[PDB]
Design a protein around this ligand. Structure first.
Ligand SMILES: *[C@@H]1O[C@H](CO)[C@@H](O)[C@H](O)[C@H]1NC(C)=O
Ligand SMILES: COCC(=O)NCc1ccccc1
Length: 339
């Protein structure tokens, strides 16, 4: 069980002005810290944010949050469920900003909602230094779906924050799960372009300088922002991601068969020069905080093992690979896929 702490700085808020927060489970014999970013789509104007407030309010407010959460998957403390980092300090950061963790805008007389995702991450890091993070050797910023994209947008800013605060010894790294999307043609970019304006959204400096004003939406797409990042980032992405297919209007004849095969081929291509990655040929979405995340394998290697091999590489390894991308071209050609 991780225990809830609401942020002491009450100016850093969820969408409706209630305080943001984090769930923490300490491990005093450990200098590793795992900070996980929750996902859950987004909203990009007044009317669709109002709708989300009616029926997805826990993703916009802390007023109804429970006092504890069970750590599952990579956030579990039992070695049988989490062979990778079972002894680490565990942090779950709830997603209540609806902005893919990019916003820096307060609620005010001109703004009905606050979009403070990028500031929530910074404030969590600041307050955790007083609870033990000051002694860390590794800070792994992880996240799933919109939280996975959030890792790509924020990992270098976290590294810069700790440098300027006087902690150059803490190594900051990223783990982006199911947040690596393609801006491809549908089967039958605009919402993010509107979102960034609505949220006062922020993207990494080197990527923003390449694409410049009005084109910062490009930095939300993994294959475009990843080459600009300096921190080490491990990328987990199903080749046939269900959220990718949703936005592509895919719900089997030749036309659709070729569409699906070309989508897997394009995703595989964008990962060819990503040295730390895990990309199985499955139709699914998210994995790292699922209890059965130990089950899937690529070329005979599990995801917890690949992450362990990544740790060793950051001290090629014999029988310990870190780049694992399926080559077979159809969903569930890998027998280990989630049932
Ligand atoms: C609280 O957070 C806001 C927004 O990031 C910041 O401007 C302010 O300085 C913070 N206050 C303190 C006391 O850290
Ligand atoms: C589709 O997955 C749900 C989600 O939250 N996507 C965030 C995102 C939107 C646009 C570009 C990149 C990332």
């Amino acid at each position: 069980d991780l225990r809830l702490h609401l942020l002491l700085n009450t100016s850093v808020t969820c969408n409706d002005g209630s305080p943001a927060g984090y769930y923490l489970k300490e491990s005093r014999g450990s200098r590793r810290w795992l900070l996980f970013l929750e996902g859950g789509w987004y909203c990009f104007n007044r009317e669709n944010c109002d709708s989300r407030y009616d029926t997805m309010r826990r993703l916009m407010s802390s007023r109804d949050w429970p006092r504890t959460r069970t750590g599952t998957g990579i956030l579990s403390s039992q070695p049988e469920e989490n062979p990778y980092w079972w002894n680490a300090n565990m942090v779950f950061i709830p997603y209540c900003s609806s902005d893919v963790w990019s916003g820096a805008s307060s609620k005010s007389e001109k703004n009905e909602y606050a979009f403070m995702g990028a500031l929530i991450i910074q404030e969590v890091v600041r307050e955790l230094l007083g609870r033990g993070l000051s002694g860390a050797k590794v800070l792994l910023l992880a996240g799933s779906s919109a939280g996975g994209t959030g890792v790509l947008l924020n990992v270098d800013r976290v590294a810069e924050q700790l440098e300027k605060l006087g902690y150059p010894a803490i190594q900051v790294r990223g783990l982006a799960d199911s947040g690596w999307f393609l801006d491809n043609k549908q089967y039958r970019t605009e919402a993010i372009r509107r979102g960034i304006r609505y949220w006062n959204g922020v993207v990494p400096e080197r990527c923003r300088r390449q694409f410049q004003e009005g084109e910062e939406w490009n930095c939300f797409f993994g294959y475009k922002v990843y080459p600009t990042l300096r921190s080490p980032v491990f990328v987990v992405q199903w080749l046939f991601d269900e959220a990718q297919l949703t936005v592509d209007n895919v719900h089997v004849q030749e036309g659709l068969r070729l569409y699906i095969q070309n989508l897997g081929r394009e995703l595989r291509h964008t990962l060819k020069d990503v040295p730390a990655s895990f990309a199985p040929a499955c139709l699914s979405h998210e994995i790292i905080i699922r209890s059965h995340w130990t089950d899937v394998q690529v070329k005979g290697t599990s995801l917890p093992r690949a992450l362990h091999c990544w740790d060793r590489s950051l001290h090629p390894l014999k029988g310990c690979p870190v780049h694992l991308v399926d080559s077979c071209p159809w969903p569930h050609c890998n027998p280990s896929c989630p049932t």
